[PDB]
Design a protein around this nucleic acid. Sequence first.
DNA 1: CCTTAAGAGAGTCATAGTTACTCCCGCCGTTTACCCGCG
DNA 2: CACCTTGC
RNA 3: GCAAGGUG
DNA 4: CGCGGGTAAACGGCGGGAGTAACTATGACTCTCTTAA
Length: 1107
Amino acid sequence: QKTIIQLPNDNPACPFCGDHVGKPSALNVHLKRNHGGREVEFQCSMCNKADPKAHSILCHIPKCKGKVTEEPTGDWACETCNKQFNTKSGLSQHKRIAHPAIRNQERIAASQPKPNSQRGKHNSCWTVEEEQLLAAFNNMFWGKKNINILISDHIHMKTAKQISEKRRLLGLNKNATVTTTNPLPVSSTCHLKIRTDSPNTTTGLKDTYMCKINENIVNQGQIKFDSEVISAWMAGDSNIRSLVESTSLDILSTFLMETPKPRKKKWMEKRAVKKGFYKRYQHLFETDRCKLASIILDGTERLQCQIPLTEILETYKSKWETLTPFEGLGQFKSHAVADNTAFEILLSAKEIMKNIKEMNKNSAPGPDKVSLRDLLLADPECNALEKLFNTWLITGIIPNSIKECRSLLIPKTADPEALKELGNWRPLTIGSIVLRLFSRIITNRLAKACPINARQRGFIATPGCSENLKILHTIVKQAKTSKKSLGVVFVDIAKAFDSVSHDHIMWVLQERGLDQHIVNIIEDSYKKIHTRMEVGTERTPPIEIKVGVKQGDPMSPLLFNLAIDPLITALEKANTGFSYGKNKITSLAFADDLVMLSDTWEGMNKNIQILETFCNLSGLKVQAKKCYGFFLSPTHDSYTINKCDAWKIDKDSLNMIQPGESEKYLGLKVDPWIGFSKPVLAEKLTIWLKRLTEAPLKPSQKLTMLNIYTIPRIIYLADHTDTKKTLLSSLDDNIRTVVKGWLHLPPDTCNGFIYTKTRDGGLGVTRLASLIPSIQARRLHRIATSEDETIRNIAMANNIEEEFQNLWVTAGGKKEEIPRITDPVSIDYRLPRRILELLNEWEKPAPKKMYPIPCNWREAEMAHWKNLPCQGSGIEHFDNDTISNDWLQFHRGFSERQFLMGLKIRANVYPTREYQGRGRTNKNVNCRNCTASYESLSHILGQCPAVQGARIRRHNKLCSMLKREAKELKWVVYEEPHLHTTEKELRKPDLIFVKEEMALVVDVTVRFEYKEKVFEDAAAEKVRHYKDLTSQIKELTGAKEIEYFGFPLGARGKWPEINEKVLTALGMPDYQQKRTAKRFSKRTLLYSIDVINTFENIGKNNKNNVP
DNA sequence: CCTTAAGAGAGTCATAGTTACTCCCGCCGTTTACCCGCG
DNA sequence: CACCTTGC
RNA sequence: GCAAGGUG
DNA sequence: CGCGGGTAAACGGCGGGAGTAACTATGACTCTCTTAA
Ligand SMILES: [Zn+2]
Ligand SMILES: [Zn+2]
C-alpha cells in the first residue's frame, strides 16, 4: 500500500523501518535510497489528496482550501458515470466527449427525422386503392356524358364532395400522376487484352548498344566490357550464356577474395548472473549497442525456434513453387507508357561507384560471402565492374551461378508459444551482393523510365507517410466541416510481395513499354531462382522461387508498384471518389496498403466491385478481417459515424470502427471520432526510462543510450501527431528529473547545462517542447511545396499557412523570418556546378531539398545559461570550443566518481558552504578552513592556504609532464633554473628549454576562468615580471635568443590559445597540436579534481578518521 | 601555486482562451390536405 | 556518421 | 536484408 | 368535371445566439534545500 503520509508530518518515523529520518524530504531520501520499492504516497490531510511527490503535497499545504471533494449537484446525471449536470447542456456534452459511443447512438436515433406532420393534420381517411381506382376511372371518365355513374357509389362510404376534395389533393379538376427512377453500379474492367508484340522495339536498346560499342571500339572510348563476349553477342552466338557465365565466374573469382579470416578483437551465489549481465551490457556498449538499445528499450533478445526443418521446408517449398494460372489483367491499364530513352544510355563506372556509395556497407554478405567492402577492395575503380556489368547488359544473359541466395526467417512475434507457429516468421531472402548492386542500378534506370501514379507514396522520393497521414486527417476534418457524407474503406491484401506470380508481372511489363532486351533480362533475373533456408546449423536444399518477388532484391518494390498501378488507374477511371473541390480524389496508396474514399455508400459499393474484379484478374485474396472501414454522414449540427450499413468486402462484413475505436495505420491510431487517437507518449516514455534506470549502464552510459537511441522513437509519433506544448513540457520535465536522479545532481541545477550540446559543454539532452515544433513546421512546409498538385491544393484550401506561421512562432522563429510557404526551397547538389555538368544524370547526386528552421534552440539554452549569475559564471569560455568539452564525450580514464564530480565542478554547484549557503540567505558562509567570507570554490584555488603544498606539487607535476615531452622533441631541458636577477633573487622560471641557441622561457599556471581576461592578465604578468633577465640566462645557458612567453591554463580545463602559441613555437603539427591540447586539458581537469578531493578530505575526513 | 558574487527549479492553483461543436432554436415562410359553391 | 520511422 | 523518408 | 377563393398547422430555412465540458495555456504565487565499486 502507498503508505499514507498525511502532511504536515515534520520528522516522521519512516514506517518501513519506523525511523525518524527528518523533514518529509528527508523521509523521501530514506525511502528512495534504502527502503525503496515499498509503496508510499504523501497525503494531503485536509483534502486527503495523495501524491507520491512530497513537493506537490507541500503545494497543497498553503494552496489547499480544506476538504475539496464535494461534487456539484444538478438534474442531469450522465447515465454511464451519472455525472450530475446543470442542464442537458452538461449532460449530452458529457456524452459528446466523455461518453461518445452512446452519443453517436443518440445522434443517429434523433437523426431519423420521421417528423412529417407538415401535412398540417388535414389528412383524412382516404384509401390508396380508392385513390388509384378514382384516378383510372377519371382517365376513363374525362368529361364524357354520364361522368359520375360509377364514381358516386363504387367508392363506398364517400361523396362527390369527397371526390372533389381528393382531386383537389391531386389534380384539382381531375386526377394526377407520379414517377420514379433507379441507379446502377459499375464493373467490367476485365476485357481487351492488349499484348501483340514487343512494347518497345525489340532491338531499340540493342541497336543503341550496338552503335555505342561500335563508337567505343572505333574511338577506344572509356566504356568497359569484355571484348570477346560482346564480339560473339554481336556475332549472334548461340551459346552466349555459356561464355558469359565463364567470364562472370572469372571476374567474380577476382571478387571472391580469400575474405579476411575473422579478425574481430552457500556456493550458490547470484553474483554470476549479475556479472554476466553487466559483462554482456558493457561489451555490447563497447561493441554495437543498437542491439543493446533494442534489448533494453524493447526488453527483448534474439530468437531462433527449432520447428521441424521438415515442416518449415514443406511450407515454404509448397509456397514459393506453388503457382496460379495468370489469365491476364483484362482492361486494367497503368499510368501510361514508359519511356525507353532512359536506358539508351550505357553503364558508366562512375555511375556504378555512385550507386555503391548509396549502399548499406554493414550488410551480411550473400552466399558468395563477398561484401561491398570486399568488393571495393577488389576493384576500387569499378573498372572490371563496369566491364562485366556491360558484358551482361549488352548480352542480356545474367549468369545463373550468382542466382543462388540465402533465406532467413524473422521471429515476428515475441511470445515463444506464438513463435512456435510458422506465421511469426517473415522470410528474408539475401542474395549475392553483386547481384544486389546490379539490381539496384537497373532499378534506378527503370524507376526513371516507368512513371507511377502520384497517389502511390511508397518507395519514392516524396516523404510518404507524413503526406498520407496529414492528407487523411485533413480530408476527415474538411468533410466534417463541409457537412457532406463520406465513406472510408481501409484495404489490405495478404502476401503482397509473395502471392505475386512471375508470369503476371511478365505480362504487366509487356504493355508498359520496354525493349525486349531488358524484358528478357528481367525474366532471366527472375528465372532459375534457387535459395536455401539458413537455420541454425542447417540450410535447406535448394528451393526454386516461382511465385513472390525476391524478398530483398531492390527490384521487388518497383515491380510490385508497377503491377499495382493498374488498380489505381481503374479506380480513378471510376472518378466517383470524394469530390474535394474540383478533384474527385478516390483513394490513397502507400506500397501495398491503400484506402478508398467515395462519396456515397453505393459509390463505395461500386468501388468494391471494381476491387473484387481486380482480385479476380490477379487471383488475389483480400478479407474483411484483414481490412477496416467506416462511414460519415452529416446532420443539421454535427456528423454521424457508421450510421449506415457495414460493407461487404470480399462478400464479408468489413470490420467497422466505432467512436473510441482505433485501428493502426502507418503506426498511427486513426480514430474516426477524433481523427488520430492521442498517442500514449507518457506511458511508453516512463516505461523506457524505468528500463534504462534498472540496468548495469554506468550513468554516463545511461545518458548516452538515452540521447542517442531512445528519443527518436518518441520523436516519430510526437511529431507526426499534432502535439501541444504543455504535454511536451511535462515529458521534458519527467526526463529532466529522471536524468538528474541518474547522475545524482543537486535538484536546483540549472536546465541550460542539461539542454546545451556536449560540443558546447552541456549534456546534449533534447528539449521536446522546443524540438518537436520545429520538426512539425518542417513537415508542414515540406508537404505544402509538394509535387502532387492535388496534395498542394488540398493543403492550401485547408489553409495550412496559419498553422505554419503559428508553429514557426511557437518553435521560436520570428514573425518576419516566417518564410513564404509558397516559395521554392534551397536545392543543393553537393557538387560544384562545373562538376555537375561534367557528369551525366545517371551519375548526378540526389538534390536533397534543404528547408528552413524556425530557429536554433540549443543556442537559446546556452544564452540563458550565460545570463545566469551564479550557475552561469565563466561558462562563456566554453562556448563553441571543440577542445575543452571533448572529455564530456570521451571521459576515458576518468573515474565515474571523478567524472560526476567533474560535471559538478564544471557547473559550479559542488557542495560548499557557499553552495549550501546559495539561495538560502540566513546561514554561515565563512570558509571553515582559512577565513574566506564565502566558503567558495575559487578561494580553494590559491587564496585558501592549507592546500599550498598540493597546489605546488600539481603545478610542478604539469611542468614535469611538459618537460618529459620536451626532450622527446629535442628541446634541451633548462627548466627549474634557479636564477638571480638584478636584485640577485631567485626568479626561477618554470621552463627555459634551450635549442640550437634559442632558450624558451615559460610560465606554467592554471587559473579558474572567473573573468574573461584571466589568461591575458596571466600572460601580461608573465612577460611583465619576467622582462629584464635576458643577459643572465644568455650567458648561463650560453643562448643567443630568449623567449618570455607563458603557459596559463583553465582550472576547469579550459585551454587558452596562448599555450597553443607555445605549441606552434614548439613546432608540433596541427593534428598533434589538437591531440596535445585535448589531453593536456583533461590532465588539468583531473588534477583540479585531485585538489578538490584533497580539500574535501581536509576537515571532513580529518574529523571522520580523527574526531 | 591565485582570487571579487551567491536560486533555481519543482510545483499547484486561477484564470482566460478556444474547440468543437453541439445545441438549439425561435420566428417567419412554405406545404398540405381539404373546405366551400357553380356552368 | 550515427540513430529513428514504415513497409515489406 | 531491401526501398524510401526524417533527425542531430 | 371543372374551378376559383378560402383554410390554418407541422416543419424547415434561416438569423443568431447562447452556452459549454474540457482541454490548453499563461500568471501568480510557494517550497525546495546532502550519498560515488
Ligand atoms: Zn490538498
Ligand atoms: Zn578558504
